[PDB]
Amino acid sequence: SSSEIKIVRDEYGMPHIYANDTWHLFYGYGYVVAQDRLFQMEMARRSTQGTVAEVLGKDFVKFDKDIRRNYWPDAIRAQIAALSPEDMSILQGYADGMNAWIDKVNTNPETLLPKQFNTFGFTPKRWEPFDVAMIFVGTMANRFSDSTSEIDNLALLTALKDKYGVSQGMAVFNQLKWLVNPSAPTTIAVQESNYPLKFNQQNSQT
Amino acid sequence: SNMWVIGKSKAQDAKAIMVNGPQFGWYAPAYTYGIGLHGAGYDVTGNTPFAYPGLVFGHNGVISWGSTAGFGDDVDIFAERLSAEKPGYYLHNGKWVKMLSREETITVKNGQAETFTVWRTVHGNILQTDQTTQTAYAKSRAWDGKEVASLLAWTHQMKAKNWQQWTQQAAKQALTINWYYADVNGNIGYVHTGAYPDRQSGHDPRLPVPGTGKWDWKGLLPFEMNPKVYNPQSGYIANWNNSPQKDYPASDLFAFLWGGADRVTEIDRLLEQKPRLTADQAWDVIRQTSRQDLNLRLFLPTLQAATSGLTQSDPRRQLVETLTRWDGINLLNDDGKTWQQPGSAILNVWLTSMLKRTVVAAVPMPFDKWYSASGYETTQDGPTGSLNISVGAKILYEAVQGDKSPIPQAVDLFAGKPQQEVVLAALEDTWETLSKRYGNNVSNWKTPAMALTFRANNFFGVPQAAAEETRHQAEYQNRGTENDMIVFSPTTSDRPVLAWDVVAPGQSGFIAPDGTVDKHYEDQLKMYENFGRKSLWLTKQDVEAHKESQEVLHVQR
Ligand SMILES: O=C(O)Cc1ccc(O)c(O)c1
Numbered sequence: 100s101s102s103e104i105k106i107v108r109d110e111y112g113m114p115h116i117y118a119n120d121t122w123h124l125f126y127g128y129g130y131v132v133a134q135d136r137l138f139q140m141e142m143a144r145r146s147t148q149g150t151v152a153e154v155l156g157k158d159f160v161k162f163d164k165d166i167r168r169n170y171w172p173d174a175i176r177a178q179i180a181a182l183s184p185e186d187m188s189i190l191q192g193y194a195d196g197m198n199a200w201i202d203k204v205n206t207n208p209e210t211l212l213p214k215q216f217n218t219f220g221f222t223p224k225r226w227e228p229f230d231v232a233m234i235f236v237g238t239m240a241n242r243f244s245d246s247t248s249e250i251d252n253l254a255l256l257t258a259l260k261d262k263y264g265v266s267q268g269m270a271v272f273n274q275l276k277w278l279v280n281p282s283a284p285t286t287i288a289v290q291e292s293n294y295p296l297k298f299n300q301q302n303s304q305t
Numbered sequence: 306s307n308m309w310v311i312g313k314s315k316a317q318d319a320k321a322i323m324v325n326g327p328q329f330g331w332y333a334p335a336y337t338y339g340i341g342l343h344g345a346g347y348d349v350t351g352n353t354p355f356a357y358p359g360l361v362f363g364h365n366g367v368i369s370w371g372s373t374a375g376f377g378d379d380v381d382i383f384a385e386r387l388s389a390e391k392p393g394y395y396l397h398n399g400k401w402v403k404m405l406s407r408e409e410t411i412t413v414k415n416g417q418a419e420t421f422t423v424w425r426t427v428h429g430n431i432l433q434t435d436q437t438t439q440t441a442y443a444k445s446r447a448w449d450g451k452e453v454a455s456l457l458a459w460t461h462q463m464k465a466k467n468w469q470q471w472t473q474q475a476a477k478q479a480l481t482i483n484w485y486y487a488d489v490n491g492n493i494g495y496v497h498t499g500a501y502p503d504r505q506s507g508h509d510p511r512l513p514v515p516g517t518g519k520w521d522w523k524g525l526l527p528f529e530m531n532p533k534v535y536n537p538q539s540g541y542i543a544n545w546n547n548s549p550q551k552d553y554p555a556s557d558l559f560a561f562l563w564g565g566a567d568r569v570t571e572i573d574r575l576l577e578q579k580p581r582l583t584a585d586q587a588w589d590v591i592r593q594t595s596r597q598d599l600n601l602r603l604f605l606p607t608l609q610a611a612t613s614g615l616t617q618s619d620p621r622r623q624l625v626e627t628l629t630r631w632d633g634i635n636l637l638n639d640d641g642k643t644w645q646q647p648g649s650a651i652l653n654v655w656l657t658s659m660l661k662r663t664v665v666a667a668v669p670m671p672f673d674k675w676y677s678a679s680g681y682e683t684t685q686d687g688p689t690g691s692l693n694i695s696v697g698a699k700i701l702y703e704a705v706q707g708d709k710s711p712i713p714q715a716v717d718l719f720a721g722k723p724q725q726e727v728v729l730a731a732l733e734d735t736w737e738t739l740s741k742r743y744g745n746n747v748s749n750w751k752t753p754a755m756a757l758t759f760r761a762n763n764f765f766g767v768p769q770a771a772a773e774e775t776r777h778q779a780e781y782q783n784r785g786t787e788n789d790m791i792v793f794s795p796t797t798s799d800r801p802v803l804a805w806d807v808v809a810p811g812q813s814g815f816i817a818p819d820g821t822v823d824k825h826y827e828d829q830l831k832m833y834e835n836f837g838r839k840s841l842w843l844t845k846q847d848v849e850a851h852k853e854s855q856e857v858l859h860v861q862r
C-alpha cells in the first residue's frame with residue numbers, strides 16, 4: 100500500500116517510520132514529532148522567526164527585532180520555490196504530518212493539548228514548509244555558523260594603535276588575535292596535508 | 306563538541322568505532338530527537354537536533370556519520386559608503402545603488418505594536434550604521450543563498466553507501482561544520498565542510514573591508530581546498546573543535562583561537578596510550594575527558610620550575626606539591642557537592658591573578674575585560690556549555706613558552722620581570738585568597754564542585770517548557786549533550802553493526818492537560834548520569850523484537 104504509514108515505537112519510545120514514498124515517510128516523521136515535542140517545536144518556531152512577543156509580551160520585543168534584522172525571509176522562500184518536486188516533498192510531507200496531529204489536538208484539547216499551551220495561554224497553529232526550513236536555518240545557520248566580531252576587532256586595533264603607536268599596535272594585535280599559529284594541534288597530521296592559502300595579516304585594506 | 310573515530314588498525318574486536326559528543330548545552334526537553342526512517346531509499350537510525358529532516362548523528366547499516374562545529378572564517382563585514390543626501394543609497398562600483406528594505410510590525414501580547422525597517426545591500430543585511438562617518442556595516446555570509454541546500458545535503462547523505470557518495474553530499478553542505486565517516490569494512494574519514502570566500506589579495510579577514518567595490522570577494526573556494534583526510538596513517542581521527550589542519554585560519558572572533566594550548570590533546574593521549582582499543586575502551590574515553598581539568602597539563606611545568614628552590618614550609622611550594630600528586634581527574638566526594646582534591650580551585654585563582662598581572666595589563670580599557678576570564682567562571686546552575694581553555698590562558702601559554710612559541714612577543718607580558726617572579730607573586734595571591742576561606746590545612750580543603758542543569762529555556766533564552774521542568778544533575782560532565790557510538794563488524798556478534806546512544810531526559814516532552822507525564826519523559830536521565838547507553842535498532846527483526854506499540858495511518862496526498 101502506497102497510502103499506508105506504519106509507526107513502530109520501541110521500548111524507549113523511539114519511533115520507526117515505514118512508508119513507501121517520500122511524502123508518506125516524512126509525513127510520518129512530522130506526525131510523531133507533533134506527538135512527542137509540540138510545545139518545544141512551536142517555541143522553536145517563534146524563536147527562529149522573531150514572533151515570541153506576541154505570546155510572551157514586552158520583555159521579548161528587542162529579541163524579536165534582533166531575530167528579524169538578522170535574516171531576509173523572501174530569500175528563503177525563493178530557495179524553497181526552486182526545489183525539485185522530490186525535495187519539496189520532504190518539507191511538505193513533514194509540515195502536513197505535523198498538521199494532521201495538530202488538527203486532532205485542536206479538535207480534542209481536553210486530552211491532547213500539551214499542558215504548557217494552557218499554562219502560557221495560546222494554542223498551536225499549522226505549519227508550512229517555510230516554518231520547517233526555518234527550524235534548521237534559525238539554529239544551525241543563523242546562529243551556529245554566523246560568528247564574527249570584525250567591528251569589535253577594529254575598535255580593539257584602534258585602541259592598541261593609540262597606546263603603542265601605529266606599527267606597534269598592529270604587532271600587539273597579532274600577538275593577541277593571530278591569524279594562524281603553526282603549533283596548534285590539528286585533526287589532520289602534517290604528513291597528510293596542510294592548508295594551501297596564505298592571508299594578509301596587516302589590515303592591508305585600509 | 307568532540308568526536309573520536311577508530312579505524313581498522315587501531316580497533317580491537319571490530320574494524321571501526323565512532324564516538325560522538327556534540328555539545329550544545331543541556332535542555333528539557335532534550336535538544337535532540339530519536340527517529341528511525343525505513344522506506345523511499347532510506348534505512349536509517351539515530352538522533353538529531355530539533356527533529357530536522359536530516360539526522361545529524363546515526364547510521365544506515367553500511368556507513369556512519371557525525372559532526373562537530375567547524376569555526377572557519379566564513380563571515381566578513383563590508384563598510385558601506387552612505388550619503389547625507391540621497392539616503393537609502395550606497396556607493397558601489399561607481400554608482401549610487403538603492404538599498405532593499407522591508408517593513409516589520411512586531412505584535413506584542415499586552416502592549417502596543419512596534420514597527421521598524423530592515424535594510425540590505427548587495428553585501429547582506431545592515432548590522433549598524435555610523436552616522437558621523439556615513440558608514441553602514443553589512444554582514445556578508447559565504448553560505449548566503451544556500452541554507453536550504455545545506456539541510457537537504459544533510460538529508461541525502463543518509464543514503465550514501467561509500468566515501469565517494471558521501472563526499473558528493475559533503476560538498477553541498479555550506480555551513481562551517483566538521484563531518485565524519487566510518488564504514489562496515491573499517492574505512493574512516495573527515496571533511497571540514499562549508500563555503501569559504503575567495504578573497505582579494507591583501508584582505509585581512511579579521512577586520513572590516515570597504516564596500517565600495519574593490520574589496521568584494523571574487524567568489525567561493527572550490528571543495529578541493531576543504532581540509533579532508535581518508536584512512537589516516539595514525540589509525541584514528543579526533544577533534545574537539547580544534548584546528549582541522551596546519552595553517553588553516555579560524556573564525557575572526559576575538560575570543561576564539563587555535564593555539565599550542567588546546568583541549569583535543571587530552572583525547573590524543575588517551576588514544577595514543579594503547580596500541581588498540583575495544584568499543585568498551587572507546588566509550589570509556591567519555592568518562593575520562595568529562596572529568597579532566599584542562600589547565601593542569603599546561604601550567605604544571607611552569608609552577609614546578611618556579612617553586613623548585615623553595616623550602617618545604619613555604620606555602621607556595623605546598624600548593625604546587627598538591628598539584629604534582631594529582632592526575633587532574635575531578636571526582637565528587639560523598640556529599641555530592643565538593644571535589645575530592647582542590648586542584649581546580651587553585652588553578653582558577655592562580656590563573657586569574659596571572660592574567661590580571663600579564664595580558665590584562667597590556668590591553669587598554671575597556672578591552673582588558675576580554676582577557677581576564679580564567680575559564681572556570683560559572684553560576685550555581687553550572688556551565689551553560691563545554692569547559693574550554695580561556696583566550697587569556699591561550700595567550701599566556703605562548704608567553705611562558707618563550708622562544709619555543711612561534712608567535713612573536715611584540716610586548717613582553719612579564720614587563721621586564723623574570724617569569725618565576727610573576728608566577729610566585731600569583732601563587733602568593735592564591736595562598737592568601739584560599740587559606741583565608743579554608744584555613745591552612747590543605748588536606749581538609751573541600752572545594753565546590755560544578756553541577757549540571759537541563760534548562761527549561763532554549764539556547765535563545767526563550768521558554769520551551771515550564772520552569773519546574775528544569776532538571777539538575779550533581780556532577781558537571783564536560784561531554785556531549787548526547788553521546789552515540791557505532792561499532793562496525795563486531796567479532797563478538799553476528800550482526801554487521803552495533804550502535805548505542807542516550808537522549809536525556811527522554812524521547813518525549815509530552816505532558817497531558819491533567820498533568821500526567823508521558824511514560825518516556827525521563828527514562829533516560831539516570832542513564833545519562835551513570836555513563837550508560839541504550840541500543841539503537843536498525844533492522845525490522847530487531848525493531849519488531851523490541852516493539853512496545855504500533856500505529857498505522859492511511860493517507861493520500
Ligand atoms: O560545538 C558547538 O559549539 C556547536 C555545534 C555546531 C554544529 C554541530 O554539529 C555540533 O555537533 C555542535
Ligand SMILES: [Ca+2]
Nearest residue numbers: 380381510557
Ligand atoms: Ca571575517
